[PDB]
Amino acid sequence: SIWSRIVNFGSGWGFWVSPSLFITSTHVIPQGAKEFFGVPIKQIQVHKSGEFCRLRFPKPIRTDVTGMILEEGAPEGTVVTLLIKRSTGELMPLAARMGTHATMKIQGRTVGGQMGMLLGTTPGDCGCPYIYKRGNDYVVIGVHTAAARGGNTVICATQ
Ligand SMILES: *[C@@H](CC(=O)OCC)[C@H](C[C@@H]1CCNC1=O)NC(=O)[C@@H](CC(=O)[C@@H](NC(=O)c1cc(C)on1)C(C)C)Cc1ccc(F)cc1
């Protein structure tokens, strides 16, 4: 039921990490949104770090899901799964080995990202999660923001 946590958000998608934590790409969100999922935006705790957007709701929204671990990137060489969901409803899991993780700071504020190579993606896919299993837990490392033209390179934005 992991696929049920991937919901269309604005021009792309978003992922429920826990009953109250929703992650997406910053620039797929409508610029004039005054509410999300029935909750006024004033009551939602928003944290935008570059192209990584994080929404913490004041109550459990998805009371049916379990909590996963949100971590900034994956150790280099880790292969993860980009859970792409298309407009048709078709489910397309893509494998990608993760490479160099980069971070840029300005004024106390760190934006993050990590590159990967697919082992494709299209303009409607921003916001779909990158995930891999570690032990008896599932770890989500970011949401897709970019992909090289024609090649295998992809990029997940990190917190
Ligand atoms: C997703 C964002 C979106 O809504 O699309 C239309 C604006 C989109 C996904 C890639 C486009 C083609 N295939 C994809 O997987 N991302 C973008 O449009 C972002 C920019 C790019 O992806 C370019 N690629 C790169 O910059 C790049 C660099 C490297 C090393 O690899 N790729 C082009 C392929 C367009 C920009 C964007 C826009 C809006 C967002 F919300 C996030 C990101």
Numbering used by the authors: 4 to 122, 133 to 172
Give the original sentences from the paper that presented this experimental model.
By contrast, the GII.4-Pro HOV (2002 GII.4 variant)–rupintrivir structure reveals that the BII-CII loop, in comparison with published apo structure, undergoes extensive conformational change to accommodate the P3 and P4 residues and the bulky fluorophenylalanine at the P2 position of rupintrivir. However, in this structure, the BII-CII loop extends far past the open conformation observed in apo GI.1-Pro. Considering that part of the loop is involved in crystal packing, the observed conformational change may not entirely be in response to rupintrivir binding as the crystal packing could have also contributed. Also notable is the orientation of the P2 sidechain of rupintrivir. While remaining the same in the GII.4-Pro Sydney and GII.3-Pro structures, this sidechain adopts a different conformation in the GII.4-Pro HOV structure with a hyperextended BII-CII loop. Upon rupintrivir binding, not only does the BII-CII loop open in GII-Pros, but the R112 sidechain also extends away from the active site. The P2 sidechain of rupintrivir displaces the R112 sidechain from its relatively stable conformation in the apo protease state. Our FRET inhibition data analysis reveals that rupintrivir is almost two orders of magnitude less potent against GII-Pros than GI.1-Pro.
